[PDB]
């Protein structure tokens, strides 16, 4: 993994994220939603587990993006949890949770759930 993870990944909706997997489990990079402008680039930080098994198992990882940058503040944060699978067709299969800051009465509807698959192509 690690080396295999570092690079650019694209999901099915048009988002891109570039990440560096450091020697001791760190993941650091940027997530860009669309257009191709600095305005849709947000910082991402996460971790991956740097000594994955040798039975062809995926590498468990996760990262968070807070949706605030210098052009936008969407008062929300998204975390992606999943695993990296390398090889010919490497992919990161994830499930995500997006929480928006709400008032206490609207807290019950503050989190959306979805999934995303990222590829290098």
- Using CA atoms of 45, 51, 52, 56 in order, give the dihedral in degrees to the nearest 10: 130
- Closest to another protein by CB, 42 vs 48, is 42
Q: Cβ closer to another protein: 67 or 86?
A: 67
Q: Is 67 annotated as a binding residue?
A: no
Asked if 78 and 96 count as a contact pair (C-beta separation under 8 A), the reply is: yes
Q: Return residues touching another protein (CB under 8 A).
A: 13-15, 33-35, 40, 42, 65, 67, 72, 74, 76, 78, 98, 105, 108-109
d(CA 48, CA 56): 16
Q: Which does residue 118 touch among a second copy, another protein, none (CB within 5 to 8 A, set by kind)?
A: none
């Amino acid at each position: 993994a690690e080396a295999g993870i570092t690079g650019t990944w694209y999901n099915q909706l048009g988002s891109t994220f570039i990440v560096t997997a450091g020697a001791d489990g760190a993941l650091t990079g940027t997530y860009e939603s669309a257009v191709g402008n600095a305005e849709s680039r947000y910082v991402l930080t996460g971790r991956y587990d740097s000594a994955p098994a040798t039975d062809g198992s995926g590498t468990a990882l996760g990262w968070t993006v807070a949706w605030k940058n210098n052009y936008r503040n969407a008062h929300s944060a998204t975390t992606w949890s999943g695993q990296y699978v390398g090889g010919a067709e490497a992919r990161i299969n994830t499930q995500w949770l997006l929480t928006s800051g709400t008032t206490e009465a609207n807290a019950w509807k503050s989190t959306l759930v979805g999934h995303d698959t990222f590829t290098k192509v």
